[PDB]
Enzyme design. Structure first.
Site, PDB file in Angstrom:
ATOM      1  N   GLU A  82      18.665 -12.946  -8.892  1.00  0.00           N
ATOM      2  CA  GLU A  82      17.642 -11.914  -8.861  1.00  0.00           C
ATOM      3  C   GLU A  82      17.952 -10.953  -7.732  1.00  0.00           C
ATOM      4  O   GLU A  82      18.221 -11.396  -6.611  1.00  0.00           O
ATOM      5  CB  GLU A  82      16.257 -12.523  -8.659  1.00  0.00           C
ATOM      6  N   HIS A 132       4.569 -14.239  -8.793  1.00  0.00           N
ATOM      7  CA  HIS A 132       3.552 -14.278  -7.771  1.00  0.00           C
ATOM      8  C   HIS A 132       3.883 -13.296  -6.649  1.00  0.00           C
ATOM      9  O   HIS A 132       4.986 -12.748  -6.560  1.00  0.00           O
ATOM     10  CB  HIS A 132       3.475 -15.690  -7.231  1.00  0.00           C
ATOM     11  N   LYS A 179       7.509 -17.749 -12.177  1.00  0.00           N
ATOM     12  CA  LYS A 179       7.968 -17.834 -10.793  1.00  0.00           C
ATOM     13  C   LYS A 179       6.713 -17.733  -9.935  1.00  0.00           C
ATOM     14  O   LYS A 179       6.245 -16.634  -9.649  1.00  0.00           O
ATOM     15  CB  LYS A 179       8.969 -16.733 -10.480  1.00  0.00           C
ATOM     16  N   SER A 213       0.803  -1.216   0.000  1.00  0.00           N
ATOM     17  CA  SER A 213       0.000   0.000   0.000  1.00  0.00           C
ATOM     18  C   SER A 213       0.837   1.268   0.000  1.00  0.00           C
ATOM     19  O   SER A 213       0.284   2.355  -0.199  1.00  0.00           O
ATOM     20  CB  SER A 213      -0.943   0.004   1.206  1.00  0.00           C
ATOM     21  N   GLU A 231      15.820 -16.105  -1.324  1.00  0.00           N
ATOM     22  CA  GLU A 231      15.227 -17.312  -1.891  1.00  0.00           C
ATOM     23  C   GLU A 231      16.266 -18.118  -2.659  1.00  0.00           C
ATOM     24  O   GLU A 231      17.177 -17.569  -3.278  1.00  0.00           O
ATOM     25  CB  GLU A 231      14.054 -17.000  -2.841  1.00  0.00           C
ATOM     26  N   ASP A 235      17.393 -15.550  -5.298  1.00  0.00           N
ATOM     27  CA  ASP A 235      16.784 -14.238  -5.117  1.00  0.00           C
ATOM     28  C   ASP A 235      17.492 -13.654  -3.909  1.00  0.00           C
ATOM     29  O   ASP A 235      17.062 -13.875  -2.779  1.00  0.00           O
ATOM     30  CB  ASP A 235      15.285 -14.330  -4.910  1.00  0.00           C
ATOM     31  N   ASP A 261      13.887  -7.220  -9.853  1.00  0.00           N
ATOM     32  CA  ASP A 261      12.535  -7.229  -9.283  1.00  0.00           C
ATOM     33  C   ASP A 261      12.201  -5.876  -8.686  1.00  0.00           C
ATOM     34  O   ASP A 261      11.275  -5.175  -9.100  1.00  0.00           O
ATOM     35  CB  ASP A 261      12.472  -8.306  -8.197  1.00  0.00           C
ATOM     36  N   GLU A 296       5.480 -18.939   0.595  1.00  0.00           N
ATOM     37  CA  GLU A 296       5.412 -19.453  -0.762  1.00  0.00           C
ATOM     38  C   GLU A 296       5.448 -20.971  -0.824  1.00  0.00           C
ATOM     39  O   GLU A 296       5.449 -21.527  -1.925  1.00  0.00           O
ATOM     40  CB  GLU A 296       6.540 -18.915  -1.659  1.00  0.00           C
ATOM     41  N   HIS A 339      13.147 -13.996   5.697  1.00  0.00           N
ATOM     42  CA  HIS A 339      12.139 -15.034   5.845  1.00  0.00           C
ATOM     43  C   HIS A 339      12.605 -16.197   6.704  1.00  0.00           C
ATOM     44  O   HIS A 339      11.924 -17.227   6.755  1.00  0.00           O
ATOM     45  CB  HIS A 339      11.713 -15.551   4.477  1.00  0.00           C
ATOM     46  N   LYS A 379       5.195  -8.287 -12.110  1.00  0.00           N
ATOM     47  CA  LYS A 379       4.119  -8.477 -11.151  1.00  0.00           C
ATOM     48  C   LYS A 379       2.937  -7.610 -11.544  1.00  0.00           C
ATOM     49  O   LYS A 379       3.084  -6.393 -11.704  1.00  0.00           O
ATOM     50  CB  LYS A 379       4.599  -8.173  -9.737  1.00  0.00           C
TER      51      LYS A 379
END
Lengths: 49, 105, 434, 434, 434, 434, 145
Positions: free
Chosen positions: C291, C371, C394, C42, C164, C242, C318, C205, C155, C343
């Protein structure tokens, strides 16, 4: 919002049908049966008193 | 508006003249405004979103509206307003005596 | 017949339990389309922003009633009456109605939901598959998936800086075989982690977040899982990363600080030290994709990375590009990266998504449909990937239905295409030499 | 027009990476229905078995190409030509064509996929919602969800013998509010577990499996999350348990050995001591549901538990009845449990599922439509729960689209129902007194 | 095309020659539905009241022009424009339009007629059978009929206090065989009455009202006729009673006075004595159902009777519950009766009738769909009985088409269902034990 | 779209609990018709005969499975492929396929059911009312009803030889008012018989059969009932008789033996004495109709009766003509009676029924459409009466829907016709002077 | 789809070379009916009279412009909206609109033309022969000439 399209719309009020007696006979003020008078219309005669 | 419905010819005309692709928007005073300010006023509550836009204009003097039908008690079709149109001849008229009137040829 | 007669939004839940919205479009003849929006961000300086409620009483401030109201009261009045097949006209009308570059008034989620619902309703009306409607008659290439299998960075609690790690089954003959290989490698890694005593539960994910020793240990155990499944690393299955180096980049010192995620004693690497660190990783391991290997504002470092490794390793931007046409144009001009992560909700419109994909393809770049962390049961990005013949997707791991839905949709697309469907694998990495 | 023209099955993936199948049904007028099958168990004494390939070189022996071929080459030639609205006739024809009590010849997964696809195609042909087609005109009751929130037993390494814990938002005015309450309690529990340093990754159902000290620790943390979200335990949100006592039941010694999960210091209880433990848990915490409180073969224990606790707490038979009309009738005869867990793939067809639901309703039992461990993007069980007016659903946690899809379908059903939609909450527990 | 465009009402005659009303509904595409209202009562504290003219010059004040005018001038304008498949919405709108708990303003008969006409027009529009539209795809159970054979009480001049005696062929293999058994027993009893010199003319319900000696003589003659037809009493055909104990209950003395109907030396029994008499009758004869065995306001006597005879005898409350949801709640809470007689014109709406049926089913009660004293050629109650899978119907004797119409509708439904059709018979009494 | 696709018959109960058959005809566009056959006679020298099973173990030998098999396996094969609007061609094909002049090979009931089902399916296909289909555009005359109000002869134990007495409300302005007057007279007679202590339970046709003192007593009670209702006998309501004089006619001595029913003290009248008895009854009471005043084989007595009483009263031949064209033509040749009772199942088809009606009309005779003793919920004879503008119907009393259904259909027809609807009343007796 | 949407009369010639009128009725779905009126007598005591112009400058006073105008301007607006299968209602409405026992106001010829045209358009709409529509299913007797 109230846009004037082409030359506009016709103003037709509603008022009771009236027949008149003239030398030509019986005259209807309006030619329709939905009782539609052309609003604002009048006739006159002008003399030279 | 229940006695009549939108005619199919006018619906086809509006559909492939793309008049709904060229809407005009208005504020609460009925003045033309850009879609951005219309959205901004509708979000803010200063414009009613329902009665504030127009679907351009369809050309060609097509009838916009056609009579709507319903089913009578025996299963036949009938126009909605044909049979309840009137019951009395409204009396009338009045024959005003105006023999003294100079007509114009 | 094809005239839109109803546009209606409602508030639903995404894959994390957070609110999102869905839009249903009904045309005059009864054609129906439903578009579900993935959860994005947002707040964003140069990305499309989603409209959130901010009411702390409901859903922790994450309600989407304002965007739903914008669809029902603002977008619906403008769009009802449009032809459902006028995707570009509807999208441009919504862009003009919003009036802001970041789509903050209407909400990018609202515009994207209406766009997807309109496209699906038009495909339903024409009685054609969604990829056929979006990409025309010559839609045949099945994307090569980047299956996220190991998670680190922000993460995980593990001392791994890279966000990732992914397996790319580019050596498979068909997409069905590629999906089978990825599932089998996923299960072999699950068994290896259970034997090792590490955590097996999945994340956002669907990937694991174990307590590894570092990046090297994670890549070695991924290779061990590949070999345990019975596939040759570097020939059948490749490794992608990533890094998301913008998370551990010190902007004021201009140094990629690895100490943020790998403890106090981690090596602190400058731009060129990051360059040859990535080169050492590429030489040690069968890595085909990297990435976000540089910060989103390190343009000179990105250019140096493309000069050094761009000929043999796919470099995806990205956060570098953020699905922005201006940033992609700038990156093409300065020879920065050779791939863009696409995206849909970062730009908020199907027309602009396809514009970005076409601009990336024209420059020799690869567009990778991606995604979001909060997904839905909507699998439109699979149809976008097949429609654009992008050749790379992806969409997550092999665990959660938010990710499996896109793989199932790709299986359905391959079955529908039949003998025409092509899985190119390594040939879909056309941004690389040989 | 409604005559079935095409029946086609394909192999897709479930929400665990394991294969399942989906079936598409086309009628002559173009009505389309798709049914995806949740993954069940191929071993069962009196539960319907699914057909797996057993080829260890493909998906670890879990491929579903045999069932796909059974639909494409056996069921399709038999069902094509039927009217799509003949659900009972099609299901009876498939059951007769199998000719096996547990549907082992054709696979229960194949038969269930064809049943769901045919029902959805019939709903598509009549242009009615699926719940209207399945349950009739008087379908209004939105189910009360038991949202799984904490795992244990075989799903966790914590010393908790109980298989899982649920929150039941039975005090909400609408289903929308109940979903919001469940989501907020889920996020509050996530924050609490983050403060305590416990694990955050979700399991198969979407729920956390942290390393709690015991059952009381987990229930107290659930109560703390409920109060942190701003809701009153025992009045707004209640607690349910799935003990799955068949896991830690010693058949030979006739004892419930908690030492299998709670360590060497756990208490080994008999049937009476187990009933006492469940009763003291009910008196200590706001527990409204206990599922598989006794062993599936301990009928005396089930009868004693129903005599003791059946008046004030709901006793659900999951492994006790295995969605079986014979077992459910036997339990009704001996006053064992007061609820049955209805799993659509444990019995095989929609006709038999609805027969089990109506038998339970006629006996004063509650029918709880349940998920499986491996789910799909299919959300038919939501329409089953609404259509039968069951008033209770168990469709997992608030963290994965395999579970969130059912919640979104229930939100959609509530939106279409509008003013006639009914959320009963506590009045949905009609098997209890007051 | 499914939008209601025309609602007409007209005044017709019932099976007794008294006026009633019928309603016809036409949708835009021409789907047609006709609903005929049975003759009910315009008085009652807690029941829906019909509207009558009150003009003593026309039909003795029993005209229905006021309700017909209400449908044509008040209901029709409110209902035209609704979707014909919005039965719950139409019914709620008409309930709100009445604005009265007992539907006294518009008239319960008018509201029920419009409800039935709307449901039948919706079934015609969808081209499905009425029971399929009302109850969904899982509608297979053909009700067991309790058909009147012998009358007494206030319907006869014999010294019999009990209002009705019925035969229940619950041992029949199909509904067709049950109908044949009932017709043959009816004819054999006719032959026996002719031999004995008693009367043969039938009453309002189609059954005989001969001048017997008492209750025991009547039941003995019924058993003799059952054996004369060639069927075993207590195995093939059972007896049922409709005592209508309110008619011979003295509220002032709190006693059941049989002297009102059985003569001057008739026994006068308290509540406990009435229970003893009913238990003696059940032990003596194969009585399986007793209806209104206690007064409509004797809740303590009803509770004691359900305690004593509720495990082996179905106890139906007709005047006890008056098919009212609130009275049924109170009865289920207080363990009074185990069955409810469902009359659709005592409520005035199909939605609320189905609500009462499923509410009774959820408590272990059986809903017995019933006819009225003045019926019509309309046979919607048969479709209601099949749609809810109630398994019990009480639609009269075998001698007038106000009952034969419903019997023929059930024959047609059984023919349409084919192999699917089920006649549970003795199993349809699920409110009993074993 | 009008081609007959399905013809299917089934066995259903009639108004007396005896079996009968109903046929359903489906055309390829979905038009549907259903014809239900009244119970006639399986024997008769010159009357069409119905087919009964004759198996005494099923329904006492009165089953209709043989005629159901005749429709399903013989008639349906011939008829399927015909145009549904070819009623004459279908009926002639059925007559030719039968072969026998009495319709004994296939059964008159089977032929009549197929004829009515075809006519109703053709009316349904054209979307016209059934009376408009049968009689054309000029269909407006509502029949003057002849309500049977008192029974006698073989229908009663009273010493009355006449089989029944009727009220004819020929003074009403509309059919609605005529039905209201008949209902009020029926209720007044019910009250009178209740006060007098006589029986009230109705017979097969819905009328009373009390134990009167004689014919004069019965006519006096009827006249007092008319006066109690508030109508003037001889101006508003008239009397009618159906003597059924063939029942008590002794063919050996050519005498009319009243001692068969009126006891040993009754007077035995010859043909001329029977003439004077009928004539004096006509002068004493306002009798406008006498049916079966003489024996079925007393042609000389019938000629004498027409010569003397045929100018002022209506003489109906029920068993005299048995709806046979040959007997009707013979009676027209020698001026025997001036009215014929038309029974549709007594002849076999609708084509021959309409032929007999037109032949009766052409000779000045009045055709009265009559009900059989065992009726159904089918109300085709009302449409037949309106379609031919016969102006008279005989469909029983005002107390059973087997009879009330015809009156309700006549009310529906009157309301559908609206302004154009006509009620001739006394003008319908066009066979009488003035 | 069976609703009368157009009623139009035109002046044609009869056998004797004298004027008469014909009426065409069109329904919503395109069903068509055309009724031509035989020439009768404009004078009669208790017989329905037809409407003639009376202008000797055209057709010797036998022109049928007045009845054609009556159909086009009076009957057409009264009948449009009715179902074409409502023959009795249309005829009663026309008789009431005339208001004269001999139908001298509108003209018996005009009313008969509209009646025949409506019957023929109703037969065309139902795709049945005219005798089948007029007399029902039991029409079989060929007349003796």
């Amino acid at each position: 919002k109230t846009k004037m399209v082409k030359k506009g719309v016709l103003k037709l009020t509603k008022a009771p049908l009236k027949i008149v007696k003239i030398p030509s006979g019986n005259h209807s003020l309006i030619k329709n049966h939905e009782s539609f008078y052309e609003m604002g219309k009048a006739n006159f005669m002008i003399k030279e008193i | 508006m229940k006695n009549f419905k939108i005619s199919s010819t006018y619906r086809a005309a509006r559909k492939q003249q793309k008049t709904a692709n060229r809407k005009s928007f208005y504020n609460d005073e009925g003045y033309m405004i850009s879609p951005s300010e219309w959205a901004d006023g509708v979000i803010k509550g200063l414009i009613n979103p329902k009665n504030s836009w127009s679907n351009d204009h369809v050309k060609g003097y097509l009838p916009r509206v056609s009579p709507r039908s319903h089913w009578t008690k025996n299963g036949y079709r009938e126009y909605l307003g044909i049979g309840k149109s009137r019951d009395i001849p409204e009396k009338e008229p009045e024959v005003i005596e105006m023999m003294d009137l100079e007509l114009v040829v | 017949m094809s005239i839109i007669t109803d546009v209606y939004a409602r508030e639903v839940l995404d894959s994390r339990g957070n609110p999102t919205l869905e839009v249903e479009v009904y045309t005059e003849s009864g054609a129906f389309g439903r578009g579900m929006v993935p959860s994005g961000a947002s707040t964003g300086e140069h990305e499309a922003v989603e409209l959130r409620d901010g009411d702390k009483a409901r859903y922790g401030g994450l309600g989407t009633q304002k965007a739903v109201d914008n669809v029902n009261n603002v977008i619906a009045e403008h769009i009802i009456g449009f032809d459902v097949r006028d995707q570009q006209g509807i999208d441009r009308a919504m862009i003009a109605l919003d009036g802001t570059p970041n789509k903050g008034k209407l909400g990018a989620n609202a515009i994207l939901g209406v766009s997807i619902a309109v496209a699906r309703a038009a495909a339903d009306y024409l009685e054609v598959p969604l990829y056929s409607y979006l990409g025309g008659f010559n839609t045949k290439v099945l994307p090569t998936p980047m299956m996220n299998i190991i998670n680190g960075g922000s993460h995980s609690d593990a001392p791994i800086a890279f966000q990732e790690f992914m397996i790319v089954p580019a050596g498979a003959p068909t997409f069905k075989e590629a999906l089978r290989w990825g599932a089998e490698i996923f299960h072999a890694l699950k068994k290896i982690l259970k034997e090792r005593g590490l955590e097996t539960a999945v994340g956002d994910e669907g990937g694991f977040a174990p307590r590894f020793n570092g990046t090297e240990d994670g890549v070695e155990t991924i290779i061990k899982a590949i070999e345990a499944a019975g596939y040759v690393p570097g020939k059948d299955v490749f490794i992608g990363l990533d890094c998301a180096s913008s998370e551990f980049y010190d902007a004021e010192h201009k140094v990629y600080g690895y100490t943020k995620f790998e403890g106090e004693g981690a090596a602190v690497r400058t731009a060129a030290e990051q360059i040859d660190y990535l080169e050492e990783l590429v030489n040690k391991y069968p890595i085909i994709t990297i990435e976000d290997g540089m910060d989103e504002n390190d343009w000179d470092g990105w250019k140096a990375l493309t000069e050094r490794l761009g000929g043999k390793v796919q470099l995806v931007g990205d956060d570098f590009f953020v699905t922005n046409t201006a940033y992609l144009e700038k990156g093409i001009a300065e020879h920065a990266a050779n791939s863009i992560l696409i995206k849909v909700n970062q730009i908020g419109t199907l027309t602009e998504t396809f514009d970005a994909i076409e601009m990336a393809k024209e420059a020799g770049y690869t567009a990778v449909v991606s995604h979001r962390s909060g997904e839905t049961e909507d699998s439109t990005i699979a149809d976008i990937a097949v429609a654009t013949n992008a050749g790379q997707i992806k969409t997550g791991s092999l665990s959660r239905t938010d990710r499996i839905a896109k793989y199932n949709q790709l299986l359905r697309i391959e079955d529908q295409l039949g003998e025409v469907a092509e899985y190119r694998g390594l040939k879909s990495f056309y941004n690389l030499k040989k």
